[PDB]
């Protein structure tokens, strides 16, 4: 198990434009195209991302290319964010993957409200942190995924993913 395998499980793989859990146009391995309700706008974003005129369908190789870029972008974003870098640096590699997972799903803006959770994680108060993380829109809207990510933060193991 690693961050790539983990997000592959959580996001799936679809080669045609689909709507994510929030109703937003997406492709590949959870590559958000746009929050716009216009399919044409989404198709434009896809073409720009891939570098060719696609009309809504990509190959597995192309999906994996975008996926690698997205994982890279999430990490680089954490490292440039003053509110996130210290907590990330304080973690082991397994829990770091859980951090990347969250940023991949909700972005840096989606995680701005997790200040108290972040403190508890840096304090290594794993059970308290797990309890706090679940008190969120995130947990309520995607409970099964959140539970897996939270278990990863609580235990520092891959137990929530090893069966999957
Ligand atoms: F280190 C982190 C980071 Cl960078 C992050 F964005 C979240 Cl949501 C998190 F929980 C942890 Cl531990």
GROMACS .gro file of N, CA and C and ligand atoms in nm:
model
  504
    1UNK      N    1   0.084  -0.124   0.000
    1UNK     CA    2   0.000   0.000   0.000
    1UNK      C    3   0.086   0.127   0.000
    2UNK      N    4   0.036   0.232  -0.067
    2UNK     CA    5   0.099   0.364  -0.072
    2UNK      C    6  -0.006   0.467  -0.115
    3UNK      N    7   0.031   0.596  -0.123
    3UNK     CA    8  -0.066   0.703  -0.154
    3UNK      C    9  -0.139   0.682  -0.289
    4UNK      N   10  -0.066   0.632  -0.389
    4UNK     CA   11  -0.125   0.604  -0.520
    4UNK      C   12  -0.231   0.493  -0.513
    5UNK      N   13  -0.196   0.381  -0.449
    5UNK     CA   14  -0.289   0.268  -0.434
    5UNK      C   15  -0.411   0.306  -0.348
    6UNK      N   16  -0.385   0.386  -0.246
    6UNK     CA   17  -0.487   0.433  -0.151
    6UNK      C   18  -0.592   0.518  -0.221
    7UNK      N   19  -0.547   0.619  -0.295
    7UNK     CA   20  -0.638   0.708  -0.368
    7UNK      C   21  -0.707   0.637  -0.484
    8UNK      N   22  -0.637   0.542  -0.546
    8UNK     CA   23  -0.700   0.456  -0.648
    8UNK      C   24  -0.823   0.383  -0.592
    9UNK      N   25  -0.811   0.330  -0.471
    9UNK     CA   26  -0.925   0.266  -0.403
    9UNK      C   27  -1.037   0.368  -0.374
   10UNK      N   28  -1.000   0.482  -0.317
   10UNK     CA   29  -1.097   0.582  -0.273
   10UNK      C   30  -1.167   0.655  -0.387
   11UNK      N   31  -1.096   0.675  -0.498
   11UNK     CA   32  -1.148   0.754  -0.610
   11UNK      C   33  -1.202   0.672  -0.727
   12UNK      N   34  -1.154   0.548  -0.740
   12UNK     CA   35  -1.189   0.462  -0.855
   12UNK      C   36  -1.119   0.504  -0.983
   13UNK      N   37  -1.156   0.441  -1.095
   13UNK     CA   38  -1.105   0.480  -1.227
   13UNK      C   39  -1.217   0.474  -1.330
   14UNK      N   40  -1.247   0.590  -1.390
   14UNK     CA   41  -1.348   0.601  -1.495
   14UNK      C   42  -1.292   0.684  -1.611
   15UNK      N   43  -1.309   0.634  -1.734
   15UNK     CA   44  -1.242   0.694  -1.850
   15UNK      C   45  -1.326   0.794  -1.930
   16UNK      N   46  -1.452   0.809  -1.891
   16UNK     CA   47  -1.541   0.909  -1.949
   16UNK      C   48  -1.582   1.007  -1.840
   17UNK      N   49  -1.609   1.132  -1.880
   17UNK     CA   50  -1.654   1.235  -1.786
   17UNK      C   51  -1.774   1.185  -1.703
   18UNK      N   52  -1.762   1.200  -1.571
   18UNK     CA   53  -1.868   1.163  -1.476
   18UNK      C   54  -1.880   1.272  -1.368
   19UNK      N   55  -1.985   1.266  -1.287
   19UNK     CA   56  -2.002   1.360  -1.177
   19UNK      C   57  -1.956   1.299  -1.045
   20UNK      N   58  -1.875   1.373  -0.971
   20UNK     CA   59  -1.822   1.325  -0.842
   20UNK      C   60  -1.929   1.327  -0.732
   21UNK      N   61  -1.889   1.302  -0.608
   21UNK     CA   62  -1.985   1.292  -0.497
   21UNK      C   63  -2.059   1.423  -0.469
   22UNK      N   64  -2.000   1.535  -0.511
   22UNK     CA   65  -2.060   1.668  -0.494
   22UNK      C   66  -2.138   1.716  -0.617
   23UNK      N   67  -2.139   1.633  -0.721
   23UNK     CA   68  -2.211   1.665  -0.845
   23UNK      C   69  -2.127   1.737  -0.949
   24UNK      N   70  -1.995   1.737  -0.930
   24UNK     CA   71  -1.904   1.811  -1.018
   24UNK      C   72  -1.839   1.721  -1.123
   25UNK      N   73  -1.829   1.772  -1.245
   25UNK     CA   74  -1.767   1.699  -1.356
   25UNK      C   75  -1.622   1.662  -1.326
   26UNK      N   76  -1.591   1.534  -1.348
   26UNK     CA   77  -1.465   1.472  -1.308
   26UNK      C   78  -1.430   1.364  -1.412
   27UNK      N   79  -1.303   1.325  -1.416
   27UNK     CA   80  -1.258   1.216  -1.503
   27UNK      C   81  -1.140   1.140  -1.440
   28UNK      N   82  -1.114   1.019  -1.490
   28UNK     CA   83  -0.998   0.940  -1.449
   28UNK      C   84  -1.005   0.895  -1.304
   29UNK      N   85  -0.899   0.925  -1.230
   29UNK     CA   86  -0.889   0.887  -1.089
   29UNK      C   87  -0.914   1.011  -1.004
   30UNK      N   88  -1.042   1.051  -0.998
   30UNK     CA   89  -1.084   1.167  -0.920
   30UNK      C   90  -1.023   1.299  -0.965
   31UNK      N   91  -0.998   1.314  -1.095
   31UNK     CA   92  -0.951   1.444  -1.147
   31UNK      C   93  -1.067   1.541  -1.169
   32UNK      N   94  -1.085   1.633  -1.074
   32UNK     CA   95  -1.188   1.736  -1.086
   32UNK      C   96  -1.159   1.826  -1.206
   33UNK      N   97  -1.259   1.842  -1.293
   33UNK     CA   98  -1.244   1.924  -1.412
   33UNK      C   99  -1.289   2.068  -1.388
   34UNK      N  100  -1.402   2.083  -1.319
   34UNK     CA  101  -1.467   2.213  -1.299
   34UNK      C  102  -1.587   2.199  -1.205
   35UNK      N  103  -1.619   2.308  -1.135
   35UNK     CA  104  -1.740   2.314  -1.053
   35UNK      C  105  -1.858   2.370  -1.132
   36UNK      N  106  -1.831   2.411  -1.256
   36UNK     CA  107  -1.933   2.461  -1.349
   36UNK      C  108  -2.035   2.354  -1.389
   37UNK      N  109  -2.165   2.391  -1.395
   37UNK     CA  110  -2.268   2.295  -1.435
   37UNK      C  111  -2.272   2.270  -1.587
   38UNK      N  112  -2.183   2.337  -1.661
   38UNK     CA  113  -2.175   2.322  -1.806
   38UNK      C  114  -2.084   2.207  -1.848
   39UNK      N  115  -2.141   2.107  -1.914
   39UNK     CA  116  -2.062   1.995  -1.968
   39UNK      C  117  -1.958   2.042  -2.069
   40UNK      N  118  -1.995   2.140  -2.152
   40UNK     CA  119  -1.900   2.198  -2.247
   40UNK      C  120  -1.779   2.261  -2.181
   41UNK      N  121  -1.801   2.329  -2.068
   41UNK     CA  122  -1.693   2.388  -1.989
   41UNK      C  123  -1.601   2.278  -1.936
   42UNK      N  124  -1.661   2.168  -1.890
   42UNK     CA  125  -1.586   2.052  -1.840
   42UNK      C  126  -1.500   1.990  -1.950
   43UNK      N  127  -1.560   1.976  -2.069
   43UNK     CA  128  -1.490   1.919  -2.185
   43UNK      C  129  -1.370   2.005  -2.224
   44UNK      N  130  -1.386   2.138  -2.214
   44UNK     CA  131  -1.278   2.232  -2.242
   44UNK      C  132  -1.163   2.213  -2.144
   45UNK      N  133  -1.196   2.203  -2.015
   45UNK     CA  134  -1.097   2.178  -1.910
   45UNK      C  135  -1.022   2.047  -1.934
   46UNK      N  136  -1.094   1.944  -1.977
   46UNK     CA  137  -1.033   1.815  -2.010
   46UNK      C  138  -0.931   1.829  -2.123
   47UNK      N  139  -0.972   1.890  -2.234
   47UNK     CA  140  -0.884   1.911  -2.350
   47UNK      C  141  -0.756   1.985  -2.312
   48UNK      N  142  -0.771   2.089  -2.231
   48UNK     CA  143  -0.660   2.171  -2.182
   48UNK      C  144  -0.565   2.087  -2.095
   49UNK      N  145  -0.622   2.001  -2.010
   49UNK     CA  146  -0.543   1.915  -1.921
   49UNK      C  147  -0.464   1.807  -1.996
   50UNK      N  148  -0.527   1.748  -2.098
   50UNK     CA  149  -0.468   1.637  -2.176
   50UNK      C  150  -0.378   1.686  -2.290
   51UNK      N  151  -0.412   1.802  -2.345
   51UNK     CA  152  -0.339   1.858  -2.459
   51UNK      C  153  -0.385   1.807  -2.595
   52UNK      N  154  -0.511   1.768  -2.604
   52UNK     CA  155  -0.572   1.726  -2.732
   52UNK      C  156  -0.725   1.737  -2.727
   53UNK      N  157  -0.788   1.735  -2.844
   53UNK     CA  158  -0.933   1.742  -2.856
   53UNK      C  159  -0.994   1.604  -2.829
   54UNK      N  160  -1.050   1.586  -2.709
   54UNK     CA  161  -1.090   1.453  -2.659
   54UNK      C  162  -1.239   1.419  -2.675
   55UNK      N  163  -1.324   1.521  -2.666
   55UNK     CA  164  -1.469   1.501  -2.648
   55UNK      C  165  -1.506   1.397  -2.541
   56UNK      N  166  -1.451   1.415  -2.422
   56UNK     CA  167  -1.501   1.349  -2.302
   56UNK      C  168  -1.448   1.212  -2.262
   57UNK      N  169  -1.359   1.153  -2.343
   57UNK     CA  170  -1.305   1.020  -2.314
   57UNK      C  171  -1.153   1.022  -2.321
   58UNK      N  172  -1.089   0.957  -2.224
   58UNK     CA  173  -0.942   0.945  -2.219
   58UNK      C  174  -0.899   0.799  -2.203
   59UNK      N  175  -0.770   0.773  -2.221
   59UNK     CA  176  -0.714   0.639  -2.205
   59UNK      C  177  -0.670   0.619  -2.060
   60UNK      N  178  -0.642   0.494  -2.022
   60UNK     CA  179  -0.590   0.465  -1.888
   60UNK      C  180  -0.456   0.534  -1.863
   61UNK      N  181  -0.368   0.532  -1.963
   61UNK     CA  182  -0.237   0.599  -1.954
   61UNK      C  183  -0.256   0.748  -1.925
   62UNK      N  184  -0.348   0.811  -1.997
   62UNK     CA  185  -0.379   0.952  -1.976
   62UNK      C  186  -0.436   0.978  -1.836
   63UNK      N  187  -0.529   0.893  -1.791
   63UNK     CA  188  -0.584   0.904  -1.656
   63UNK      C  189  -0.474   0.897  -1.549
   64UNK      N  190  -0.382   0.802  -1.564
   64UNK     CA  191  -0.271   0.786  -1.469
   64UNK      C  192  -0.173   0.904  -1.473
   65UNK      N  193  -0.155   0.963  -1.591
   65UNK     CA  194  -0.070   1.083  -1.604
   65UNK      C  195  -0.127   1.200  -1.522
   66UNK      N  196  -0.256   1.229  -1.541
   66UNK     CA  197  -0.325   1.330  -1.460
   66UNK      C  198  -0.321   1.299  -1.310
   67UNK      N  199  -0.336   1.171  -1.276
   67UNK     CA  200  -0.336   1.125  -1.136
   67UNK      C  201  -0.202   1.157  -1.067
   68UNK      N  202  -0.092   1.122  -1.134
   68UNK     CA  203   0.042   1.152  -1.082
   68UNK      C  204   0.062   1.302  -1.060
   69UNK      N  205   0.020   1.382  -1.159
   69UNK     CA  206   0.027   1.528  -1.148
   69UNK      C  207  -0.054   1.580  -1.029
   70UNK      N  208  -0.174   1.524  -1.011
   70UNK     CA  209  -0.262   1.565  -0.902
   70UNK      C  210  -0.206   1.532  -0.763
   71UNK      N  211  -0.150   1.413  -0.748
   71UNK     CA  212  -0.085   1.371  -0.623
   71UNK      C  213   0.033   1.464  -0.592
   72UNK      N  214   0.116   1.488  -0.694
   72UNK     CA  215   0.230   1.579  -0.685
   72UNK      C  216   0.183   1.719  -0.640
   73UNK      N  217   0.082   1.772  -0.708
   73UNK     CA  218   0.025   1.903  -0.675
   73UNK      C  219  -0.026   1.913  -0.531
   74UNK      N  220  -0.086   1.805  -0.480
   74UNK     CA  221  -0.141   1.803  -0.344
   74UNK      C  222  -0.030   1.814  -0.239
   75UNK      N  223   0.077   1.736  -0.260
   75UNK     CA  224   0.196   1.738  -0.175
   75UNK      C  225   0.262   1.875  -0.178
   76UNK      N  226   0.289   1.925  -0.299
   76UNK     CA  227   0.354   2.055  -0.316
   76UNK      C  228   0.272   2.165  -0.249
   77UNK      N  229   0.139   2.155  -0.258
   77UNK     CA  230   0.048   2.249  -0.192
   77UNK      C  231   0.055   2.249  -0.040
   78UNK      N  232   0.055   2.129   0.019
   78UNK     CA  233   0.075   2.112   0.163
   78UNK      C  234   0.205   2.180   0.208
   79UNK      N  235   0.313   2.155   0.134
   79UNK     CA  236   0.445   2.207   0.171
   79UNK      C  237   0.455   2.361   0.163
   80UNK      N  238   0.370   2.422   0.081
   80UNK     CA  239   0.367   2.568   0.064
   80UNK      C  240   0.267   2.638   0.156
   81UNK      N  241   0.186   2.560   0.226
   81UNK     CA  242   0.085   2.612   0.317
   81UNK      C  243   0.137   2.615   0.461
   82UNK      N  244   0.143   2.735   0.520
   82UNK     CA  245   0.197   2.753   0.656
   82UNK      C  246   0.117   2.682   0.766
   83UNK      N  247  -0.012   2.662   0.741
   83UNK     CA  248  -0.101   2.596   0.837
   83UNK      C  249  -0.095   2.444   0.828
   84UNK      N  250  -0.035   2.391   0.722
   84UNK     CA  251  -0.035   2.247   0.694
   84UNK      C  252   0.104   2.182   0.701
   85UNK      N  253   0.206   2.256   0.658
   85UNK     CA  254   0.342   2.202   0.652
   85UNK      C  255   0.395   2.148   0.787
   86UNK      N  256   0.378   2.225   0.898
   86UNK     CA  257   0.428   2.175   1.027
   86UNK      C  258   0.366   2.041   1.068
   87UNK      N  259   0.234   2.027   1.053
   87UNK     CA  260   0.167   1.903   1.092
   87UNK      C  261   0.214   1.787   1.003
   88UNK      N  262   0.221   1.814   0.873
   88UNK     CA  263   0.269   1.715   0.776
   88UNK      C  264   0.411   1.667   0.809
   89UNK      N  265   0.502   1.761   0.833
   89UNK     CA  266   0.640   1.730   0.871
   89UNK      C  267   0.650   1.645   0.998
   90UNK      N  268   0.553   1.663   1.088
   90UNK     CA  269   0.554   1.594   1.218
   90UNK      C  270   0.512   1.447   1.210
   91UNK      N  271   0.449   1.410   1.098
   91UNK     CA  272   0.391   1.276   1.080
   91UNK      C  273   0.488   1.174   1.020
   92UNK      N  274   0.461   1.046   1.048
   92UNK     CA  275   0.522   0.931   0.980
   92UNK      C  276   0.465   0.921   0.838
   93UNK      N  277   0.530   0.840   0.753
   93UNK     CA  278   0.490   0.827   0.612
   93UNK      C  279   0.348   0.774   0.587
   94UNK      N  280   0.299   0.685   0.673
   94UNK     CA  281   0.163   0.631   0.659
   94UNK      C  282   0.059   0.742   0.684
   95UNK      N  283   0.075   0.815   0.793
   95UNK     CA  284  -0.015   0.926   0.826
   95UNK      C  285  -0.003   1.044   0.728
   96UNK      N  286   0.117   1.064   0.674
   96UNK     CA  287   0.137   1.160   0.565
   96UNK      C  288   0.047   1.129   0.445
   97UNK      N  289   0.033   1.001   0.412
   97UNK     CA  290  -0.055   0.957   0.304
   97UNK      C  291  -0.200   0.995   0.333
   98UNK      N  292  -0.244   0.974   0.457
   98UNK     CA  293  -0.378   1.017   0.501
   98UNK      C  294  -0.400   1.169   0.483
   99UNK      N  295  -0.298   1.249   0.514
   99UNK     CA  296  -0.301   1.394   0.490
   99UNK      C  297  -0.316   1.430   0.342
  100UNK      N  298  -0.236   1.365   0.257
  100UNK     CA  299  -0.244   1.387   0.112
  100UNK      C  300  -0.383   1.351   0.059
  101UNK      N  301  -0.438   1.239   0.108
  101UNK     CA  302  -0.572   1.193   0.070
  101UNK      C  303  -0.677   1.303   0.092
  102UNK      N  304  -0.678   1.361   0.212
  102UNK     CA  305  -0.769   1.471   0.247
  102UNK      C  306  -0.755   1.593   0.155
  103UNK      N  307  -0.631   1.636   0.129
  103UNK     CA  308  -0.607   1.751   0.041
  103UNK      C  309  -0.650   1.721  -0.103
  104UNK      N  310  -0.623   1.599  -0.149
  104UNK     CA  311  -0.668   1.554  -0.281
  104UNK      C  312  -0.820   1.571  -0.294
  105UNK      N  313  -0.895   1.530  -0.191
  105UNK     CA  314  -1.041   1.531  -0.196
  105UNK      C  315  -1.104   1.670  -0.181
  106UNK      N  316  -1.055   1.749  -0.085
  106UNK     CA  317  -1.122   1.875  -0.049
  106UNK      C  318  -1.040   2.002  -0.075
  107UNK      N  319  -0.913   1.986  -0.112
  107UNK     CA  320  -0.826   2.100  -0.135
  107UNK      C  321  -0.787   2.171  -0.007
  108UNK      N  322  -0.695   2.266  -0.018
  108UNK     CA  323  -0.651   2.346   0.097
  108UNK      C  324  -0.762   2.433   0.157
  109UNK      N  325  -0.852   2.483   0.072
  109UNK     CA  326  -0.965   2.564   0.119
  109UNK      C  327  -1.069   2.478   0.193
  110UNK      N  328  -1.088   2.355   0.145
  110UNK     CA  329  -1.181   2.261   0.207
  110UNK      C  330  -1.135   2.213   0.344
  111UNK      N  331  -1.006   2.229   0.371
  111UNK     CA  332  -0.949   2.183   0.498
  111UNK      C  333  -0.915   2.296   0.597
  112UNK      N  334  -0.942   2.420   0.559
  112UNK     CA  335  -0.912   2.537   0.644
  112UNK      C  336  -0.971   2.527   0.785
  113UNK      N  337  -1.088   2.464   0.797
  113UNK     CA  338  -1.156   2.452   0.926
  113UNK      C  339  -1.107   2.340   1.017
  114UNK      N  340  -1.006   2.265   0.972
  114UNK     CA  341  -0.956   2.151   1.049
  114UNK      C  342  -0.844   2.187   1.149
  115UNK      N  343  -0.836   2.314   1.187
  115UNK     CA  344  -0.732   2.366   1.278
  115UNK      C  345  -0.714   2.282   1.406
  116UNK      N  346  -0.825   2.252   1.473
  116UNK     CA  347  -0.820   2.178   1.599
  116UNK      C  348  -0.776   2.033   1.581
  117UNK      N  349  -0.824   1.969   1.474
  117UNK     CA  350  -0.781   1.834   1.435
  117UNK      C  351  -0.630   1.832   1.410
  118UNK      N  352  -0.583   1.933   1.337
  118UNK     CA  353  -0.441   1.947   1.302
  118UNK      C  354  -0.352   1.956   1.425
  119UNK      N  355  -0.394   2.037   1.522
  119UNK     CA  356  -0.326   2.048   1.651
  119UNK      C  357  -0.316   1.912   1.720
  120UNK      N  358  -0.429   1.841   1.729
  120UNK     CA  359  -0.431   1.711   1.796
  120UNK      C  360  -0.339   1.610   1.727
  121UNK      N  361  -0.337   1.613   1.594
  121UNK     CA  362  -0.248   1.526   1.516
  121UNK      C  363  -0.100   1.558   1.541
  122UNK      N  364  -0.065   1.686   1.545
  122UNK     CA  365   0.073   1.725   1.577
  122UNK      C  366   0.111   1.687   1.720
  123UNK      N  367   0.013   1.689   1.810
  123UNK     CA  368   0.033   1.643   1.949
  123UNK      C  369   0.040   1.490   1.959
  124UNK      N  370   0.009   1.421   1.850
  124UNK     CA  371   0.002   1.274   1.846
  124UNK      C  372  -0.101   1.215   1.945
  125UNK      N  373  -0.212   1.287   1.961
  125UNK     CA  374  -0.324   1.238   2.042
  125UNK      C  375  -0.423   1.173   1.946
  126UNK      N  376  -0.390   1.049   1.907
  126UNK     CA  377  -0.453   0.985   1.791
  126UNK      C  378  -0.603   0.959   1.808
  127UNK      N  379  -0.643   0.910   1.926
  127UNK     CA  380  -0.786   0.883   1.950
  127UNK      C  381  -0.868   1.012   1.953
  128UNK      N  382  -0.817   1.114   2.021
  128UNK     CA  383  -0.883   1.245   2.027
  128UNK      C  384  -0.892   1.309   1.889
  129UNK      N  385  -0.783   1.303   1.813
  129UNK     CA  386  -0.780   1.354   1.676
  129UNK      C  387  -0.886   1.285   1.589
  130UNK      N  388  -0.894   1.152   1.600
  130UNK     CA  389  -0.991   1.071   1.525
  130UNK      C  390  -1.135   1.113   1.554
  131UNK      N  391  -1.166   1.133   1.683
  131UNK     CA  392  -1.297   1.182   1.727
  131UNK      C  393  -1.328   1.319   1.666
  132UNK      N  394  -1.230   1.410   1.673
  132UNK     CA  395  -1.248   1.546   1.620
  132UNK      C  396  -1.267   1.552   1.468
  133UNK      N  397  -1.189   1.471   1.395
  133UNK     CA  398  -1.199   1.463   1.248
  133UNK      C  399  -1.338   1.424   1.199
  134UNK      N  400  -1.404   1.335   1.273
  134UNK     CA  401  -1.538   1.286   1.237
  134UNK      C  402  -1.650   1.390   1.255
  135UNK      N  403  -1.621   1.496   1.330
  135UNK     CA  404  -1.715   1.605   1.355
  135UNK      C  405  -1.705   1.707   1.242
  136UNK      N  406  -1.746   1.666   1.122
  136UNK     CA  407  -1.719   1.743   1.000
  136UNK      C  408  -1.823   1.717   0.891
  137UNK      N  409  -1.842   1.815   0.803
  137UNK     CA  410  -1.919   1.791   0.681
  137UNK      C  411  -1.858   1.674   0.604
  138UNK      N  412  -1.725   1.673   0.595
  138UNK     CA  413  -1.649   1.566   0.529
  138UNK      C  414  -1.695   1.426   0.570
  139UNK      N  415  -1.694   1.398   0.700
  139UNK     CA  416  -1.734   1.268   0.752
  139UNK      C  417  -1.880   1.237   0.719
  140UNK      N  418  -1.968   1.334   0.740
  140UNK     CA  419  -2.110   1.314   0.717
  140UNK      C  420  -2.143   1.284   0.570
  141UNK      N  421  -2.078   1.353   0.477
  141UNK     CA  422  -2.108   1.337   0.335
  141UNK      C  423  -2.039   1.215   0.273
  142UNK      N  424  -1.917   1.184   0.317
  142UNK     CA  425  -1.847   1.063   0.271
  142UNK      C  426  -1.797   0.979   0.389
  143UNK      N  427  -1.890   0.915   0.463
  143UNK     CA  428  -1.853   0.847   0.587
  143UNK      C  429  -1.761   0.727   0.569
  144UNK      N  430  -1.786   0.643   0.468
  144UNK     CA  431  -1.703   0.523   0.450
  144UNK      C  432  -1.557   0.555   0.416
  145UNK      N  433  -1.538   0.649   0.325
  145UNK     CA  434  -1.403   0.698   0.294
  145UNK      C  435  -1.339   0.769   0.413
  146UNK      N  436  -1.414   0.859   0.478
  146UNK     CA  437  -1.362   0.932   0.594
  146UNK      C  438  -1.317   0.836   0.703
  147UNK      N  439  -1.398   0.733   0.728
  147UNK     CA  440  -1.365   0.628   0.825
  147UNK      C  441  -1.232   0.560   0.794
  148UNK      N  442  -1.206   0.532   0.666
  148UNK     CA  443  -1.078   0.472   0.625
  148UNK      C  444  -0.960   0.566   0.650
  149UNK      N  445  -0.976   0.692   0.612
  149UNK     CA  446  -0.872   0.794   0.630
  149UNK      C  447  -0.846   0.816   0.781
  150UNK      N  448  -0.954   0.826   0.858
  150UNK     CA  449  -0.946   0.845   1.004
  150UNK      C  450  -0.876   0.727   1.074
  151UNK      N  451  -0.911   0.605   1.034
  151UNK     CA  452  -0.845   0.484   1.086
  151UNK      C  453  -0.694   0.489   1.060
  152UNK      N  454  -0.657   0.535   0.941
  152UNK     CA  455  -0.516   0.551   0.904
  152UNK      C  456  -0.445   0.652   0.998
  153UNK      N  457  -0.511   0.764   1.027
  153UNK     CA  458  -0.457   0.862   1.123
  153UNK      C  459  -0.452   0.808   1.266
  154UNK      N  460  -0.553   0.730   1.305
  154UNK     CA  461  -0.561   0.676   1.441
  154UNK      C  462  -0.451   0.572   1.469
  155UNK      N  463  -0.428   0.482   1.373
  155UNK     CA  464  -0.342   0.364   1.393
  155UNK      C  465  -0.202   0.375   1.333
  156UNK      N  466  -0.186   0.457   1.229
  156UNK     CA  467  -0.059   0.465   1.156
  156UNK      C  468  -0.031   0.336   1.080
  157UNK      N  469  -0.137   0.261   1.051
  157UNK     CA  470  -0.131   0.137   0.973
  157UNK      C  471  -0.218   0.149   0.848
  158UNK      N  472  -0.204   0.051   0.758
  158UNK     CA  473  -0.286   0.042   0.637
  158UNK      C  474  -0.406  -0.053   0.654
  159UNK      N  475  -0.443  -0.082   0.778
  159UNK     CA  476  -0.548  -0.182   0.807
  159UNK      C  477  -0.682  -0.155   0.737
  160UNK      N  478  -0.717  -0.027   0.719
  160UNK     CA  479  -0.845   0.010   0.656
  160UNK      C  480  -0.850  -0.015   0.505
  161UNK      N  481  -0.733  -0.044   0.446
  161UNK     CA  482  -0.718  -0.062   0.301
  161UNK      C  483  -0.664  -0.200   0.259
  162UNK      N  484  -0.610  -0.276   0.354
  162UNK     CA  485  -0.538  -0.400   0.322
  162UNK      C  486  -0.630  -0.509   0.264
  163UNK      N  487  -0.755  -0.511   0.309
  163UNK     CA  488  -0.858  -0.600   0.256
  163UNK      C  489  -0.909  -0.559   0.117
  164UNK      N  490  -0.897  -0.430   0.085
  164UNK     CA  491  -0.955  -0.374  -0.037
  164UNK      C  492  -0.861  -0.380  -0.158
  165LIG     F1  493  -0.063   1.703   0.786
  165LIG     C1  494  -0.193   1.718   0.756
  165LIG     C2  495  -0.231   1.797   0.649
  165LIG    CL1  496  -0.106   1.881   0.553
  165LIG     C3  497  -0.365   1.812   0.618
  165LIG     F2  498  -0.402   1.890   0.514
  165LIG     C4  499  -0.461   1.747   0.693
  165LIG    CL2  500  -0.634   1.767   0.652
  165LIG     C5  501  -0.423   1.666   0.799
  165LIG     F3  502  -0.517   1.604   0.872
  165LIG     C6  503  -0.289   1.652   0.831
  165LIG    CL3  504  -0.237   1.549   0.967
   0.00000   0.00000   0.00000
